[PDB]
Amino acid sequence: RLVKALEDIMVHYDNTTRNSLGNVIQFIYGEDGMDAAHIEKQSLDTIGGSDAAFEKRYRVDLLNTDHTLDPSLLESGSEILGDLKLQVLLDEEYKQLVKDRKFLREVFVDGEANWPLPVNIRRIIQNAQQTFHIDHTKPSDLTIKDIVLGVKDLQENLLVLRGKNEIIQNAQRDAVTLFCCLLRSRLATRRVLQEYRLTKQAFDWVLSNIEAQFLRSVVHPGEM
Amino acid sequence: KAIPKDQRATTPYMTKYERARILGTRALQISMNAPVFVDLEGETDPLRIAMKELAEKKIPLVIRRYLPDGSFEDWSVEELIVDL
Amino acid sequence: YDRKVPSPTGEYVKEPEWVLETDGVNLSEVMTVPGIDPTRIYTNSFIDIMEVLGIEAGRAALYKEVYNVIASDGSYVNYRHMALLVDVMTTQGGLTSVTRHGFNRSNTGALMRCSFEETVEILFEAGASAELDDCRGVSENVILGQMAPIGTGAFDVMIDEESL
Amino acid sequence: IFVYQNNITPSAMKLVPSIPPATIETFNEAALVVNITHHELVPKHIRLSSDEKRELLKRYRLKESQLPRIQRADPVALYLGLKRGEVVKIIRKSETSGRYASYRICM
Amino acid sequence: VGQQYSSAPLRTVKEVQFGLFSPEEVRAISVAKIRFPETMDETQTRAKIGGLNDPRLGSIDRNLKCQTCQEGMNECPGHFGHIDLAKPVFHVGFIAKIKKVCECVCMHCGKLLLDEHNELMRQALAIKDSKKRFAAIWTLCKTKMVCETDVPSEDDPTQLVSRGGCGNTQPTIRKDGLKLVGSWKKDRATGDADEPELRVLSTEEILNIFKHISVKDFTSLGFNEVFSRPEWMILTCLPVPPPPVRPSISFNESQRGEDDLTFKLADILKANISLETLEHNGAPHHAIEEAESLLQFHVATYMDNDIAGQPQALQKSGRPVKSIRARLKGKEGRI
Amino acid sequence: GLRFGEMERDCMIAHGAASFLKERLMEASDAFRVHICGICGLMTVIAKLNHNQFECKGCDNKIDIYQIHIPYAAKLLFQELMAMNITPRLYTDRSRDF
Ligand SMILES: [Zn+2]
Ligand SMILES: [Zn+2]
Ligand SMILES: [Zn+2]
C-alpha cells in the first residue's frame, strides 16, 4: 500500500519533489536536496557543553595577551597581536558562531549534537594531515584572512539550487544552513591552527575537497 | 519550450541516469558496427569503448532535460561535468 | 521523566518533571486547564492534533508517530523517507490515509494495470469526465511500447551538430 | 470578529455572509482561551501579499493547483483570517537543513 | 516497421485525452455511411456492397485499394464507419450516469435543482473532484423535487431571491432494464394532490433536457464543454469499427465468412431500418416503441452483454454471442 | 516463483532502470505504425505515402500530422474504444493549450 501511494513521486531537474500530476510535495527533496546514501552522522559541536568551553574553543582576541593565538601556532603569530582590522574579521566569525549555537539549540531543543549530514569533515581533515605529513611541531603559514575569508568564500559555493532570482537564492541559503553551521564550527580559526595545524597547502586542499564531496552528495533528478 | 544557453539553472553535472543512458545508447551503436571516435588501445567490448569515448568527451550527444512545466534545457555531453 | 535542559552555565543537565499520561482523549478541553503548559501538551491521536492545532502540527505529529513505530524495534530509517510519506498524506490540507481509499485511483492512468474485470467502466468514466492521462506511469507506457519518463528515461537524448 | 460564549443561532449564523466585501468571523470564547499558534508543533505561518504570491508562483513556475493546500477552516487559517486563494509561507525548523520553507494555499 | 516511408515526424505519446464522441464528429471523420445490412453479392456478382465492409473502410482480397491509402491488410489501419440511428438511444455504459444527471437537473428546463444560494450546495460546488463533487451535488439535489422559483437570500428569510423560473415538479426516477421511469406528484399526502403518476421517460426527452443544460451546470458536474457534453452519453450516430476490428474468416475462395460484431451490427442496422419503415408508412404508437426498444436492445448489447437477455442469434442456432466490452474481456483481460 | 511481478517492477523503478522495465514488460505484439492528427488525437489520418498526402477531414488537416509506433494490441484497444463512442486522444505535446 505504501509503494502504491508513492510510486509516482520523483525528483525533477528543479530539485523539486513531485507526483505525476506535477503537484509539489517537497519544494526541495528531503528539505536539503541531498541523496540519503551520501549522508553521515556528524557531531555539531557548537551546541554542546558550557559557555566557558565554547569560548575557550572558538574565541580569538588579538587584542589580549591571554586570549590571542600564541605565536607558535601561527607563523605571523607575533605581528598579529593588537591588529585592529583583523580583530574585526575575528569578531564577525565569533558573533556568527554564537548565533549558530543559539540557532542549533532551538532546532534540537534536546541538546542532541549528532545528526546525519553530507561530507564528513573530520575524515577530510584526518586525510589532509596524513597526506601532507603535517608536523604538529612547527607553526602554520596560514593567515587569519586565509581562514576566515577562505571558509566564507567556500560557503557561497556549496550549491543545491542555481536559479538567479531572489526566492531560489533564499531557498538555497536555507537548504545549506545546517551544513554551514557544521562547517563554520569545524573551520573556526582557533580550531584550524590550534587543533588541526593545517598549513596553507593542506587547508586549501580541505576546502576544495569539501566542495567536491558536497556537490557529489546532491540528489540526481530522476530519482524515484 | 526551450531556454537559452544562458539562464540554464539546471546542474552543470551529469546525473548517474544520463551517464547510464548515454553509455547504453552509444554502446548499442558500437555493437552495430557504427563508426567509433577514439583509439581502441585494445578494447573490443562496446560499452567499454563507449566509456572510453565519454572520458575523452568524444560523444556527439545532447541531453534534453525537461522541467515539470514543459520547458526544457539542452546540455551537450561535452559540456556536462562527469564526477560521480 | 528526565529532561535535558540548558543549565545556567550552559551545559545540558537533566531536570526531572512530573508528567500526566491519560487513557482517553479530549485535547481542546484539557489544553485549556489551568496549571499546565499548553505549549507542550501532546497526544498520539494525530487526528485531534490536526483539528485543534492545524495541519502543519498534524503533519509533525504524524511524523512523530510513524517514527516511534520504527524506533520501537531499534530500527532506523533516514528522515526523508518518513518525511515524504508524511507530506503526501498531508498535501491536500487534510489527513489522507494510504491503506487504499479509492476503488479507482490514488494516482494512476486509465491505462495502467486494468483493475476489476470491468476496466471498461474505468474507461467509460474517464471518457465522461474528459480524464487527462499524463503518461508518466510504467504500465501506460508499456501499453504504448515506450519507456517511462522515469530515472533513466526522464529526459531525451539527441544528436549534436557541434562536435568537430 | 464576533466572539460568543456558548454558541450562535443557526438563524443568526446565516446572517454572517451579507455585507460584501467586508467579511465577518466568529469565535467561541473557549477556542481562544489558549493561543494555538504558541504551540510547539505549530510552525510560523506568514500570509503572503498577492505580489509575493505571483513571485512565488512565477519562479517555481506552478499552477495554483500544484501547491500544497490548507483548509479554509484550519485552526491556523482561521487565526490569521485567511481567505480562499491566499498563500502562506510556512517556515519550520528542520533536522536536515536548518530551516525549510514550504507553502500552502487556502482552499 | 513497414519498410515504407512517411514524411510525418516520428514521435511518442505524451498525453492521452479521454472523452466522448459527439454525433457531429462521428460523422466528420467517418468514411462510409452504411445502409444495406448485408455484404458481398450484388445479384450474385460477389465483391462488396456500399452498405458494409467496403464503401471506404479497410479492404480484403489482397487489394491495395482502400481510400487511396493503398498498402494492404498489414499496413492499413482500418478506417471508421458511419451509421445514423432512426431514434436516439442510451449508451449501455452510461444509463447509471444518465439517471443521476436527471436527478440533478430539472426535467423541464435543465436548471440545476440547487443554486449557489443554498449553503450546503456551495460546499459541494467547491470540491475539485469531478467524481466526488458530482456525488456531493447529487446527494444534495435528489432531495429537492420542485424546481424552486424563489429562495431565501443571504439576508432576511423575510426576503426572497429569484432564480430560473420553472416551478414544475420533479419525478423520482427508477431504473427498469434499459428504460428510465418517472413518477410525479404535487407533494406527499397533501390534499387534492395525492397518488402518483408513472410515465416512461423517452430518450428524446432526456436528450433535449441535456441539450438545455448550461456549460456552467454540466461543468459543475464532471462534464467537459469540449470533450464530454452530457448530451453525448446518448447515441445518435453510432461508429462502425473497420474490418481490422471485426474480421471475416474466408477459407481461400467461394465461402462465406464475417465476424460476430458484423453480425450484431447487421441486427442493429436491421432493427434501425424496421423502425424507419414505421414512419415512412405511418404506424401505431405502441408499435414504433417496441421497434425503438428493439434497436436500443441491440445498440446496448452490441457494446455490453449484461441485461435482460443474451442475443446470440447470428447464423447460429446453438445461440452463441460476443460484444465489444466482451471483446475487451479478452483484450483487457489478455493484456 | 521465477516470475517478474509488481514487487520486482517496483525495485527496478527505484533503481531508475527504465529501459530494462520496458524491455521486460513489453509483449510480443508487432510495433505497428499509425498516423495521427495533431488537432484531434485520433487515428483518422488518411495516408497516401507515395503521393505524400495526409488528410484528416472533419479537421482540415494536411500539415499538422504525426506518426507513432505502438504495439498493435494498443491500436485495437483504442479502435475498440472508438467503437464504444469513447475518444482516446493521443497527443505528442505534454504542455496542454494552457
Ligand atoms: Zn486503408
Ligand atoms: Zn425547471
Ligand atoms: Zn483531426
Nearest to A222 among B15, B68, B83 (CB): B15
User: Taking CB atoms and an 8 Å cutoff, what residues of chain A touch B68?
Assistant: 12, 14, 16, 18, 22
Residue at a domain's end among E208, E236, E264: E236
Minimal-distance CA residue of chain D relative to E120: D14
Structure-block grid coordinates of residue A145: 584572512
B10: domain range? 1-84
Report the DSSP beta bridge partners of residue B76: B62
What is the rounded distance in angstroms from the CA atom of residue E165 to the CA atom of residue E144?
Answer: 15
> What distance in Å separates residue C27's CA from the closest CA in chain E?
27
What is the rounded distance in angstroms from the CA atom of residue E278 to the CA atom of residue E285?
Answer: 10
User: What kind of fold does domain F1-85 have according to CATH?
Assistant: DCoH-like (3.90.1800)
Annotated binding site of F for Zn(2+): 37, 40, 56, 59
At C45, the amino acid letter reads S
What count of other Cβ atoms lies within 10 Å of the Cβ of residue F47? 27
CA D21, D27, D31, D35 torsion: positive or negative?
positive
E258 shares a domain with E166 = no
Structure-block grid coordinates of residue C115: 483493475
Question: F96 and C143 in contact by Cβ < 8 A?
Answer: no
E335 shares a domain with E269 = yes
Nearest to A25 among C5, C84, C155 (CB): C84
Structure-block grid coordinates of residue A74: 601561527
Count helices and strands (H / E) in chain B: 2, 2
CB contact burial A41-52 (16+ within 10 A = b; e otherwise): ebbbbbbbbeee
Structure-block grid coordinates of residue A11: 525528483
Structure-block grid coordinates of residue E71: 498498402
What is the rounded distance in angstroms from the CA atom of residue E7 to the CA atom of residue F67?
Answer: 9
> What distance in Å separates residue B30's CA from the closest CA in chain C?
15
Nearest to F94 among B17, B21, B70 (CB): B70
In a domain, E134, yes or no: yes
> What distance in Å separates residue F35's CA from the closest CA in chain E?
8
Experimental determination technique: X-ray
End-to-end CA distance of chain D: 21
Q: What is the resolution of this structure in A?
A: 2.8
Q: What is the crossing angle of helices A166-175 and D50-59, to 10°?
A: 70
Contacts of E299 (CB under 8 A, 6+ apart): E85, E89, E91, E92, E235, E238, E268
Alpha carbon F36 to chain centroid, angstroms: 9
Contacts of E22 (CB under 8 A, 6+ apart): E229, E232
E220 shares a domain with E139 = yes
> What distance in Å separates residue C1's CA from the closest CA in chain F?
42
In a domain, E202, yes or no: yes
Structure-block grid coordinates of residue C148: 517511462
- Count up the domains in chain B and report the number: 1
E202 shares a domain with E69 = no
C8: CA distance to ligand 1 center in Å? Answer: 89
Ligand 3 (ion): residues with CB under 5 Å are: F 37, 39-40, 56, 59
What is the rounded distance in angstroms from the CA atom of residue A57 to the CA atom of residue A196?
Answer: 13
Residue at a domain's end among E220, E236, E252: E236
Give, in order, the Cα–Cα distances in Å from E134 to each of C31, E92, E124, E219, F86: 39, 20, 8, 10, 20
E231 shares a domain with E96 = yes
Pair type for strands A17-18 and A24-26: antiparallel
CA E249, E251, E252, E254 torsion: positive or negative?
negative
Give the SS3 label for residue C148: coil
Q: Which of F53, F31, F54 is nearest to F43 (CA)?
A: F54
E258: domain range? 15-90+237-335
A residues 131..190 contacting C (CB < 8 A)? none
What is the rounded distance in angstroms from the CA atom of residue E129 to the CA atom of residue E148?
Answer: 27
Contacts of E156 (CB under 8 A, 6+ apart): none
At D100, the amino acid letter reads Y
Instruction: Say which residue the cell 460484431 belongs to.
Output: E261
What count of other Cβ atoms lies within 10 Å of the Cβ of residue E20? 25
Contacts of A180 (CB under 8 A, 6+ apart): A155, A158, D98
User: What kind of fold does domain D35-107 have according to CATH?
Assistant: Eukaryotic RPB6 RNA polymerase subunit (3.90.940)
At D79, the amino acid letter reads Y
Q: Where are the domains of chain F?
A: 1-85
Give the SS3 label for residue C152: helix
E280 shares a domain with E230 = no
Residue B74: what are its φ and ψ, rounded to 5°?
-120, 125
Q: What is the crossing angle of helices A177-186 and A121-131, to 10°?
A: 40
Nearest to F82 among E2, E14, E21 (CB): E21
Region of A15 (left: φ > 0; alpha: ψ -120 to 50; beta: rest) is: left
Write the CATH number for B67.
Answer: 3.90.940.10
Q: Is the Cβ–Cβ distance between A7 and C151 less than 8 Å? A: no
Question: F13 and A7 in contact by Cβ < 8 A?
Answer: yes
What is the rounded distance in angstroms from the CA atom of residue A207 to the CA atom of residue A92?
Answer: 20
User: Taking CB atoms and an 8 Å cutoff, what residues of chain D touch C31?
Assistant: 34
Report the DSSP beta bridge partners of residue E173: E182
Q: Is the Cβ–Cβ distance between B3 and B73 less than 8 Å? A: yes
Order of strands across the sheet with A17-18? A10-11, A17-18, A24-26
Q: Residue E281, exposed/middle/buried by CB under 10 A (0-12, 13-18, 19+)?
A: exposed
Q: Is the Cβ–Cβ distance between E148 and E170 less than 8 Å? A: no
With helix as H, strand as E and coil as C, how does chain E read? Answer: CCCCCCCCCEECCCEEECCECCHHHHHHHCCCCCCCCCCCCECCECCCCCCCCCCCCCCCCCCCCCCCCCCCCCCCCCCCECCEEEEEEECHHHHHHHHHHHCCECCCCCCECCCCCCHHHHHHHHCCCCCHHHHHHHHHHCCCCECCCEEECCCCCCCEEECCCCCCECCEEEEECCEEEEEECCCCCCCCCCCCEEEEECHHHHHHHHCCCCHHHHHHCCCECCCECHHHHEEEECCECCCCCCCCCCCCCCCCCCCHHHHHHHHHHHHHHHHHCCCCCCCCHHHHHHHHHHHHHHHHHHHCCCCCCCCCCCCCCCCCCCCHHHHHCCCCCCC
- Count up the domains in chain E and report the number: 2
Q: Does D74 touch chain C (CB under 8 A)?
A: yes
Q: Residue E308, exposed/middle/buried by CB under 10 A (0-12, 13-18, 19+)?
A: exposed
Whether the ω angle into residue D21 lies within 30 degrees of 0, i.e. cis, is: yes
